[PDB]
Design a protein around this nucleic acid. Structure first.
Lengths: 221, 185, 141, 57
RNA sequence: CUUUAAAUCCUUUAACGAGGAUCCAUUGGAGGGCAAGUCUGGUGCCAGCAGCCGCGGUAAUUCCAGCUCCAAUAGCGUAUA
């Protein structure tokens, strides 16, 4: 129940010297503890189980089955996530999928459509994703038109925060796991696209490792 | 060869998805907190909002400093000003896309009479409009789907022959009085 | 496509016409042979008369002898088998009755566990089977 | 039994029960509102195992 | 009273005109898509349901009947291009 940090990231964030996970995303640090995100984010984080998939092995003495789960994670303002788990017990698969969804968390930088006023509500460009036969495409949309898609992109994007997006799919979209991973890859490639506002030469701030190595070397070896 | 019209158009559209809990619960909340009768009214308001949004998209996809774009631009802007949805702060072309179902469902006569405090309940307001009591500009309206404009908002009052705001009493009071006078003697 | 130019229209027109003609549903829906083989001839309903009542057996997985009516048409005289919709309505139909025969839902194809028969009966003796099943009217003899 | 080609057996032998009384509805105005407040306001479906409004447990 | 070649249709004003407002609101479904009971009785691969998968072999969440539920609601269901 009680958190005991074992990695350096958890010890530094429980040492109260890291403000947000934004600089973690600048330095692209791997996340290995799920409760660090619990330390950052408040009560705006909920879970939503997608579909329990009954896959099975087969042995000499009959066939043996185990349950494969999915879950969607991500607050309304900012980051998203996804987790896949498969185990014997459905409840342990649910908790494992929740933990793995807390591990893999990426943000999306929303853009505008044409004129710019207020806050961003749509994707900045036309981005695609594919991890199989699925060729899913994101299209920028005007303000307030609502997302239209298959309704599992609808629940994923309402978990995301992008309320205005057109979609286009191609292939065998009956398989939920491949299609969900493909739209996850499409929504995760938002930061991996060069933009005209970002051509200013980046500054290199001092790393938290570079300042707190002397603190961590006396904290935990 | 007859002097006929033959001009008919649809007003409500059916969604492609037959059954889904989200939009059904949303329109159910709209009917429950607005006192509509069926899905036809909310579908009609959604269709009018879709037509306005399509016209706005057709205006924004044109180029700036075009006379037609400016023409239906300030035409549509002044019409939404005259209905009483927008205000005097935001009269720009980029504020028309942020309108919701609430913005057009607020201007219904039933909701306006319920918010005016001249009735008790939302269904009571709907039937009180339906029972031919409340007039606008010395003209009675029995239809609850009356879009109230912004200028004609202080002209809502009971009619001259409405018994609730002065006039001849209806059937029930005179029948009760006649029955009491008959039973007294 | 493959050919891309300015003055490239005839070859692509011929390719579109040939590859549309090689479709199966388009060939079924745009040749007079399928319309000639259709007993209805594009008609939604077609009345007929009853000459016998023979019930056809079921298919391989399930076993239930479902009863059927053979109806001779009036516009063509072809002997086509119909199928009673509800349960116990074979007493409502007799020999040489005024029946109305329509399709079943698969665009003129065999449906379900009944082999060969593709049609059904919606009205017998100028009244529907629904009114006789719910007991709303009475069949006049 | 005996004669296999006999139709209407399940309705030929059955039990016949007459109808009952009937209340007043709201013609769908507050009927679906009662649906809302007896389906989602009072009880909620459990996350993992659903609970319908007609689930007579 | 008005409209109308004269009527009828609408509106207006008289007199009547509802307490279970009997002055009674119908159509297909309730295993999945597809919203909605492992409710209660009946025959138990027979009779049937089902556009697809299938459901029926002596406790059927699908068949036949009563209550409850679910969708549009003066509208709803089926076939054909």
């Amino acid at each position: 129940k009680e958190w005991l940090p074992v990695t350096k990231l958890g010890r530094l964030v429980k040492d109260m010297k890291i403000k947000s996970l934004e600089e973690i995303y600048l330095f692209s640090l791997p996340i290995k503890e799920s409760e660090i995100i619990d330390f950052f984010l408040g009560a705006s984080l909920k879970d939503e189980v997608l579909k329990i998939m009954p896959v099975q092995k087969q042995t000499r003495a009959g066939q043996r089955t185990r349950f494969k789960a999915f879950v969607a994670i991500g607050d309304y303002n900012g980051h998203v996530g996804l987790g896949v788990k498969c185990s014997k017990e459905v409840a342990t698969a649910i908790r494992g999928a929740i933990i793995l969804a807390k591990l893999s968390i990426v943000p999306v930088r929303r853009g505008y459509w044409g004129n710019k006023i207020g806050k961003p509500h749509t994707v900045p460009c036309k981005v695609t994703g594919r991890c199989g036969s699925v060729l899913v495409r994101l299209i920028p949309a005007p303000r307030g038109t609502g997302i239209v898609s298959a309704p599992v992109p609808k629940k994923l994007l309402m978990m995301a925060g992008i309320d205005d997006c057109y979609t286009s799919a191609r292939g065998c979209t009956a398989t939920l796991g491949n299609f969900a991973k493909a739209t996850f890859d499409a929504i995760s490639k938002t930061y991996s696209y060069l933009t005209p506002d970002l051509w200013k030469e980046t500054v290199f701030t001092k790393s938290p490792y570079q300042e707190f190595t002397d603190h961590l070397v006396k904290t935990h070896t | 060869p007859v002097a006929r019209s033959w001009v008919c158009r649809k007003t409500y559209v059916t969604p492609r998805r037959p059954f889904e809990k989200s939009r059904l619960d949303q329109e159910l909340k709209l009917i429950g907190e607005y006192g509509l009768r069926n899905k036809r009214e909310v579908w009609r308001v959604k269709f009018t909002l879709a037509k306005i949004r399509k016209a706005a998209r057709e205006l924004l996809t044109l180029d700036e400093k075009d006379p037609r774009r400016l023409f239906e631009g300030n035409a549509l802007l002044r019409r939404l000003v005259r209905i009483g949805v927008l205000d005097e702060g935001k009269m720009k072309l980029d504020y028309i896309l942020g309108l919701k179902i609430e913005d057009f469902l607020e201007r219904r006569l039933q909701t306006q009479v319920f918010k005016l405090g001249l009735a008790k309940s939302i269904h009571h307001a709907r039937v009180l409009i339906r029972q031919r009591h409340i007039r606008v500009r010395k003209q009675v309206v029995n239809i609850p789907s009356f879009i109230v404009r912004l200028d004609s908002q202080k002209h809502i009052d009971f009619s001259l022959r409405s018994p609730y705001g002065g006039g001849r009493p209806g059937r029930v009071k005179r029948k009760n009085a006649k029955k009491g006078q008959g039973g007294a003697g | 496509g493959k050919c891309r130019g300015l003055r490239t229209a005839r070859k692509l027109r011929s390719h579109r016409r040939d590859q549309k003609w090689h479709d199966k549903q388009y060939k079924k829906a745009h040749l007079g042979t399928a319309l000639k083989a259709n007993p209805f001839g594009g008609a939604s309903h077609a009345k007929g008369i009853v000459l016998e009542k023979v019930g056809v057996e079921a298919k391989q997985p399930n076993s239930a002898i479902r009863k059927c009516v053979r109806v001779q048409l009036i516009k063509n005289g072809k002997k086509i088998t119909a199928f009673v919709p509800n349960d116990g309505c074979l007493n409502f139909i007799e020999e040489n009755d005024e029946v109305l025969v329509a399709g079943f839902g698969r665009k003129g194809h065999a449906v379900g566990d009944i082999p060969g028969v593709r049609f059904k009966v919606v009205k017998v003796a100028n009244v529907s089977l629904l009114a006789l099943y719910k007991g709303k009217k009475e069949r006049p003899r | 039994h005996g004669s296999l080609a006999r139709v209407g057996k399940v309705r030929g032998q059955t039990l016949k029960v007459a109808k009952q009384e009937k209340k007043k509805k709201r013609t769908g105005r507050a009927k679906r509102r009662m649906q809302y407040n007896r389906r989602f306001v009072n009880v909620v479906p459990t996350f993992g195992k659903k609970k319908g409004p007609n689930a007579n447990s």
